[PDB]
Swiss-Prot record:
Highly expressed in lymph node. Expressed in thymus, spleen and leukocytes. Weakly expressed in placenta, small intestine, stomach, testis and lung. Overexpressed in B-cell malignancies. InterPro entries: Band_41_domain, FERM_2, FERM_central, Kindlin/fermitin, Kindlin_2_N, PH-like_dom_sf, PH_domain, PH_Kindlin/fermitin. It comes from Homo sapiens (Human). GO terms for biological process: cell-matrix adhesion; integrin activation; integrin-mediated signaling pathway; leukocyte cell-cell adhesion; platelet aggregation; positive regulation of cell migration; regulation of cell-cell adhesion mediated by integrin; substrate adhesion-dependent cell spreading. This is Fermitin family homolog 3. Plays a central role in cell adhesion in hematopoietic cells. Acts by activating the integrin beta-1-3 (ITGB1, ITGB2 and ITGB3). Required for integrin-mediated platelet adhesion and leukocyte adhesion to endothelial cells. Required for activation of integrin beta-2 (ITGB2) in polymorphonuclear granulocytes (PMNs). Isoform 2 may act as a repressor of NF-kappa-B and apoptosis. SUPFAM superfamilies: PH domain-like, Second domain of FERM. The FERM domain is not correctly detected by PROSITE or Pfam techniques because it contains the insertion of a PH domain. SMART domains: B41, PH. Keywords: Cell adhesion, Cell junction, Cell projection, Disease variant, Phosphoprotein. Its main location: other. The keyword Phosphoprotein applies.
Length: 577
């Protein structure tokens, strides 16, 4: 039982210095964690904490490996901190909100978790952008909803469009003005293949969430109010700032839509006040401590509500002695969600427990099944049972209200809806009728369908899709520009502006960027292979756009999720464990 071990230095503390523990070369990474929690004697929740190991540019998710396996010795510095650090996350609607993001996951997983928080479906089309208001929580599950279960006092407007700028600063803001001034934005993309710390992003940094791939999948005006609003608002701010130009009569339909959607963003009523129950309800649980617990989807469970108390099971023969939960509803907090034309009959109950409120979302089928349960839960929350005369006098109130069942249910705005070159060339008077004239076609549109057509008309523009990486090319001086564009990749004479070479993506054979020469090489069927080198923008985000767009457009048929992550990393090169 002889050891003769070495000593390691492990940091802590919002700053960077803590303490030193003693381990062998044979020590387990997970064992070093326990030795480092005892060596400080703090009262925290390290559930998310991990180690950093700067010198070799990566951490240790492998909790079990030997310390000699990573090659670590007493030499190189160690950092014990959290994996989730707060970030500023600038939105594409020119607002911002503070959230915690994963520095430990590779960026494509980090952005996916961010969009997952922000109700942004299909996160493969978005990415984080480098530098040139509510805090966070934890969810960790497939997908949950009431509006987006954000239940707190902070509900910021990222789903509703932002008011239009005053025409004062719409001209004072920086504009594109030419190519090679347009290629700067795409020089700030982060590599969505390495973690967030391999990119040099520290604790308080700012990050931008822009749409990266101009190939949008299943734009549903019902499923994604946040994904739609942010996309539309990225498009307008590429029109109002001349990042993508349109024609004189298209700015009119663009301006007419911005007015119509903004006019409707500026505008049932559950205004109400004050023996067993056995049914098959559909239950949705929420762990108070969800850091190590996922939840399944809406589970259909056999619920029993007796005298006050509620238990639920999965079958009647598995009752009553073997429940899944048992709640002291003698507490409080039942809030409803009823959409008679949508058949949503959901009740939220916040059950105060010593460990933490157990959040459960019950959902019934008919108005009559719903009226019985919510009346029982609203009186159980008041102490009384279903044996009160007011319980039947509360069920009456519900069904009486649930009788209506779906048969009958200007201000002269600015000229700031148009780009700056249309307000210096047009007086603010003769485009106002032309906006209102072209507005009559879209006045019959809903907020999401009118937003959708703004993106549909933005998709029709002749230069929709191009990303402009100005990089040198194969046999040419003058270092012309490239541009990406999902289904193509072109070449432009930088100053002339003409399109010299138009290579198609479908004729592209399998070639990838690699070398010491820092130059990309693509093969292109019929052995016509083009090569170019990075001029001042970058060389890996070009290979990320190419493989990225190739990942897109070849997804699942209708329900395009569950994408192969070992394939996305494959389309940006190199495999990892």
């Amino acid at each position: 039982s002889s050891w003769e071990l070495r000593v390691f230095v492990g940091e802590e503390d919002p700053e960077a210095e803590s303490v030193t523990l003693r381990v062998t070369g044979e020590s387990h990474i997970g064992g070093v964690l326990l030795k480092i929690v005892e060596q400080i004697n703090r009262k925290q929740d390290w559930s998310d904490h991990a180690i950093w190991w700067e010198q070799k540019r990566q951490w240790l998710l492998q909790t079990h490996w030997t310390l000699d396996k990573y090659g670590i010795l007493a030499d190189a510095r160690l950092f014990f901190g959290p994996q989730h650090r707060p970030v500023i996350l600038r939105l594409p609607n020119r607002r911002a909100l503070r959230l915690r993001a994963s520095f430990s996951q590779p960026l494509f997983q980090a952005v996916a978790a961010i969009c997952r928080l922000l109700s942004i479906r299909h996160p493969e089309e978005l990415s984080l952008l480098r530098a040139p208001v509510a805090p966070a929580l934890f969810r960790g599950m497939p997908a949950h909803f009431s509006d987006s279960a954000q239940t707190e006092a902070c509900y910021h407007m990222l789903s509703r469009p932002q008011p239009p700028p005053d025409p004062l600063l719409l001209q004072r803001l920086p504009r594109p003005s030419s190519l090679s001034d347009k290629t700067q934005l795409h020089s700030r993309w982060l590599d969505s293949s390495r973690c967030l710390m391999q990119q040099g992003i520290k604790a308080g940094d700012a990050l931008w969430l822009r749409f990266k791939y101009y190939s949008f999948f299943d734009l549903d005006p019902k499923t994604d109010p946040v994904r739609l609003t942010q996309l539309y608002e990225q498009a307008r701010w590429d029109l109002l700032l001349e990042e993508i130009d349109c024609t004189e009569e298209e700015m009119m339909v663009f301006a007419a839509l911005q007015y119509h959607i903004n006019k409707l963003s500026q505008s049932x009523x559950x205004x109400x006040x004050x023996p067993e129950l056995k049914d098959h309800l559909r239950i949705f649980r929420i762990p108070r401590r969800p850091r190590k617990l996922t939840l399944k989807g809406y589970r259909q469970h056999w619920v029993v509500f007796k005298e006050t108390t509620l238990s639920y099971y999965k079958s009647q023969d598995e009752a009553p002695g073997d429940p899944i939960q048992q709640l002291n509803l003698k507490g409080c907090e039942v809030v409803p969600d009823v959409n008679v034309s949508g058949q949503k009959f959901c009740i939220k109950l916040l059950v105060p427990s010593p460990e933490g409120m157990s959040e459960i979302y019950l959902r019934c089928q008919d108005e009559q099944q719903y009226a019985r349960w919510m009346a029982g839960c609203r009186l159980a929350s008041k102490g009384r049972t279903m044996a009160d005369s007011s319980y039947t006098s509360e069920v009456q109130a519900i069904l009486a209200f649930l009788s209506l069942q779906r048969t009958g249910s200007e201000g002269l705005n600015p000229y700031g809806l148009v780009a700056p070159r249309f307000q210096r060339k047009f007086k603010a008077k003769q485009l106002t009728p032309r906006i209102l004239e072209a507005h009559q076609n879209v006045a019959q549109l809903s907020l999401a369908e009118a937003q959708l057509r703004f993106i549909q008309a933005w998709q029709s523009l002749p230069d929709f899709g191009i990303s402009y990486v100005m990089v040198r090319f194969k046999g040419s001086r003058k270092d012309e520009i490239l541009g990406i564009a999902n289904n193509r990749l072109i070449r432009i004479d930088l100053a002339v502006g003409d399109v010299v070479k138009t290579w198609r993506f479908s004729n592209m054979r399998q070639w990838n960027v690699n070398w010491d020469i820092r130059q990309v090489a693509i093969e292109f069927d019929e052995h016509i292979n083009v090569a170019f080198s990075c001029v001042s923008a970058s060389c890996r985000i070009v290979h990320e756009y190419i493989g990225g767009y190739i990942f897109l457009s070849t997804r699942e048929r209708a329900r395009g999720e569950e994408l192969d992550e070992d394939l996305f990393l494959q389309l940006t090169g190199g495999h990892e464990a």
